[PDB]
Write a protein that binds this ligand. Structure first.
Ligand code: PLM
Length: 300
């Protein structure tokens, strides 16, 4: 488990996080569509869920939960009723599954025989292990992650895979990446959205650029700001169910309080990537434009 190391049992910290969320409900009262009692029911649904508990405690996703959430097939599995609504209806969850699809299409398009593909942070390597390698013999896969549990999980997920022997894993802080021209393709999801400082994200992109061979490509992603937050929000409100958005807003803002709130526009992301040395940017937007994918080229 992610915790201890807080030196306490996770159950003790969880009770605290639940108490704090309950107080925020009681002190702030009703919201449109969800009275106090209903909010308390939502909090209980979170606390009864394995993923819900992880989010209450840690306020972000790790390798395990990114994989399990992103690869969830709607209607499948053993989920409690409310838990299933969270897995299947929240606009941001729908968006990250769309994004996952765009990552797969982009990586597949750019794959060539013998190429070296890196994922940073690799997590369980869900996207790379899902690709079709039938016409790309000799691909080498590289996974970098700072979480030893992520690397263990990648190994376990790849154990029966055709490319199990083509994987090299490294425990490294992604923010300190210093590979020089080692990869043809690099994919990254779930780092920039946790870093509110724009310059720190630009520097991460620069390390990605430095790690790519000339002519290589980066596939990454970013969460975008909603209309309340930015005059330049790309959100298509006609592509978002109003009630499910209200549900997400209550769950995120009041209950979980997620750490993935470094939201950036297409133009901001373009500026960062161009500063880092990338050209020929292509954006692959999800339907509501909550979580675009970007493919960025390093000049030959
Ligand atoms: C079942 C408990 C509630 C589940 C709530 C899941 C909300 C996840 C939102 C995922 C998309 C945006 C955040 C991505 C963050 C990341 O990739 O690390």
């Amino acid at each position: 488990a992610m915790s201890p190391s807080s030196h306490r049992a996770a159950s003790a910290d969880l009770a605290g996080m639940v108490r704090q969320a309950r107080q925020r409900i009681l002190l702030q009262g009703n919201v449109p569509g969800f009275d106090v009692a209903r909010q308390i029911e939502l909090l209980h649904g979170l606390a009864e869920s394995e993923l819900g508990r992880f989010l209450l405690l840690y306020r972000g996703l790790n390798a395990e939960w990114t994989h399990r959430l992103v690869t969830h097939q709607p209607g499948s599995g053993a989920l409690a009723p409310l838990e299933r609504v969270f897995y299947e209806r929240l606009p941001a969850v729908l968006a990250t599954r769309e994004r996952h699809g765009h990552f797969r299409r982009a990586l597949q398009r750019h794959l060539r025989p013998g190429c070296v593909v890196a994922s940073v942070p690799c997590g369980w390597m869900s996207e790379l292990l899902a690709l079709d390698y039938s016409a790309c013999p000799g691909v080498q896969l590289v996974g970098i992650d700072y979480d030893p549990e992520a690397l263990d999980g990648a190994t376990r997920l790849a154990a029966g895979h055709a490319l199990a022997g083509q994987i090299t894993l490294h425990r490294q802080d992604a923010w300190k990446l210093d590979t020089r021209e080692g990869y043809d393709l690099l994919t990254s999801n779930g780092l920039n959205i946790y870093e509110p400082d724009d310059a720190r994200v630009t520097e991460l992109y620069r390390r990605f650029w430095q790690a790519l061979k000339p002519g290589g490509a980066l596939v990454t992603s970013f969460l975008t700001p909603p209309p309340a937050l930015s005059p330049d929000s790309p959100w298509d409100m006609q592509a978002i169910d109003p009630h499910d958005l209200q549900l997400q807003q209550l769950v995120f803002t009041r209950l979980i309080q997620p750490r993935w709130n470094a939201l950036r526009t297409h133009a901001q992301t373009r500026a960062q990537l161009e500063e880092a040395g990338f050209t020929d940017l292509r954006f692959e937007d999800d339907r509501a434009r909550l979580f675009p994918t970007v493919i960025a080229r390093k000049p030959a």
